[PDB]
Paper text:
Human shelterin consists of TRF1, TRF2, TIN2, RAP1, POT1 and TPP1, binds double and single-stranded telomeric DNA and is involved in a wide range of functions. POT1 binds single-stranded, telomeric DNA with high affinity and specificity. POT1 telomeric DNA binding is mediated by the two N-terminal OB-folds of the protein, while the C-terminal portion of the protein binds TPP1.
POT1C consists of residues 330–634 and TPP1 255–337 (TPP1(PBD)). Our data shows that POT1C consists of two domains, an OB-fold and a holiday junction resolvase (HJR) domain both of which make extensive interactions with TPP1 forming a tight heterodimer. Interestingly, the HJR is an insertion of the OB-fold and comprises residues P392-L538. Further stabilization of the bilobal POT1C structure is mediated by a Zn2+ ion coordinated, tetra-cysteine cluster (C382, C385, C503, C506) locate at the interface of the two domains. The TPP1 polypeptide spans the entire length of POT1C and makes extensive contacts with both of its domains. Interestingly, TPP1(PBD) is organized in the opposite orientation (N—to—C-terminal) to that of POT1C so that the N-terminal portion of TPP1(PBD) (α1) interacts with the HJR while the C-terminal one interacts with the OB-fold. Consistent with the POT1C-TPP1(PBD) structure presented here, P446 and Q623 make direct contacts with TPP1, while the C591W mutation most likely displaces α8 of the POT1C(OB), which indirectly affects TPP1 binding.
Residue numbers in the entry:
A (entry chain A): 332 to 633
B (entry chain B): 266 to 326
Write the structure that this text describes.
């Protein structure tokens, strides 16, 4: 049995790789190939962030980076910003033996009242990563903020603009034009906290988590390099959750080991059935053809 | 009061005396920290970008 199946375009005839490589882009194809090799070999490096608007691809900040950002963000003097009284209630806690740091927590109100904890959005200034993670478990969502000159503002977009459960949402630094926190007032519906609604209110273009991989595919007629840029179709594992979950990570590892079992020859690898599109890439003076996998998923008996 | 309860819940997540604790680290997160000495795998964004014109031709198929 094939290791992957098409989720669409099943009517297509199979095209051999040698024929694809001789043809002009853009075209769509069905293929059957062995996965000869892939990048990244270090699978933990496959998780990237991609902007749907400007097309940039970037790294997800390391956990250690966030830890440092939040440590560096410690403040002795957080503001409530009193003009925002109808938006949120606020509390500030003092500390012992923590260099006089303070934590401000702002509790966003739904329709004039504080909602249940699981429905409550928090804004936090001066919290550690560990505190933010705990708050994200007990409340609906956390937005890290800092005291600006006039209003509360998001931290640098290198920190998540929203943490909801264990999902860290990031914004594009090129495409966003940040609005201050008071603009959360423009949300008429605060009965749920939809990440894209928070993002629009704050002028953020959210980045999308993707698995990015380079598949070297071989059917014996030729070798074709095809990119995978997958949010959750291919592995049936959400790229937005994978970095926070040992079991999801283990599943991706097991899928890839299944495509390329160690110490056996390529003929003994499973076939991958894939749909691919070809397209033209220009990096200055010369043209190049590239290939991407679409409408393809891992099969049931892994 | 409910406000009081939310404030107590929030407080319970905070570490207000001495050093703060360590957030959980998954095996990929730990590995991402240890992968040194070779440029991290990436693909230039332009290699992944299918132009509007190419997308037009492709959608008609
Ligand atoms: K939305
Ligand atoms: K051959
Ligand atoms: K075989
Ligand atoms: Zn962008």
């Amino acid at each position: 049995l094939s290791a992957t199946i098409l989720t669409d375009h099943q009517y297509l005839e199979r095209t051999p790789l040698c024929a694809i490589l001789k043809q002009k882009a853009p075209q769509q194809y069905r293929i059957r190939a062995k996965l000869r090799s892939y990048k990244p070999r270090r699978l933990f490096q496959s998780v990237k962030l991609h902007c749907p608007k400007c097309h940039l691809l970037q790294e997800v900040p390391h956990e250690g980076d966030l830890d440092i950002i939040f440590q560096d963000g410690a403040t002795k003097t957080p503001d409530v910003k009193l003009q925002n009284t109808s938006l949120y209630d606020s509390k500030i806690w003092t500390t012992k033996n923590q260099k006089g740091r303070k934590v401000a927590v702002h509790f966003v109100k739904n329709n004039g009242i504080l909602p249940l904890s699981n429905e409550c959005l928090l804004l936090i200034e001066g919290g550690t990563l560990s505190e933010i993670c705990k708050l994200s478990n007990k409340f609906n969502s956390v937005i890290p903020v800092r005291s600006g000159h006039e209003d509360l503002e998001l931290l640098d977009l290198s920190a998540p603009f929203l943490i909801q459960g264990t999902i860290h949402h990031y914004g594009c630094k090129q495409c966003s034009s940040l609005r201050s926190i008071q603009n959360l007032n423009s949300l008429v519906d605060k009965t749920s906290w939809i990440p894209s609604s928070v993002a629009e209110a704050l002028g953020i273009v959210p980045l999308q988590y993707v698995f990015v991989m380079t598949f070297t595919l071989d059917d014996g007629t030729g070798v074709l390099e095809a990119y995978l840029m997958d949010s959750d179709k291919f592995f049936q594992i959400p790229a937005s959750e994978v970095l926070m979950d040992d079991d999801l990570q283990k599943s991706v590892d097991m899928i890839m080991d299944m495509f390329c079992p160690p110490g056996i020859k390529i003929d003994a690898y499973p076939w991958l059935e894939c749909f691919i599109k070809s397209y033209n890439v220009t990096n200055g003076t010369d043209n190049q053809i590239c290939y991407q996998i679409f409408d393809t998923t891992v099969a049931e008996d892994v | 009061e409910h406000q009081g309860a939310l404030v107590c819940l929030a407080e319970s997540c905070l570490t207000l005396e001495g050093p703060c604790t360590a957030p959980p680290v998954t095996h990929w997160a730990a590995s991402r920290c240890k992968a040194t000495g070779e440029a991290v795998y990436t693909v230039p964004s332009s290699m992944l970008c299918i132009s509007e014109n190419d997308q037009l031709i492709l959608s008609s198929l």
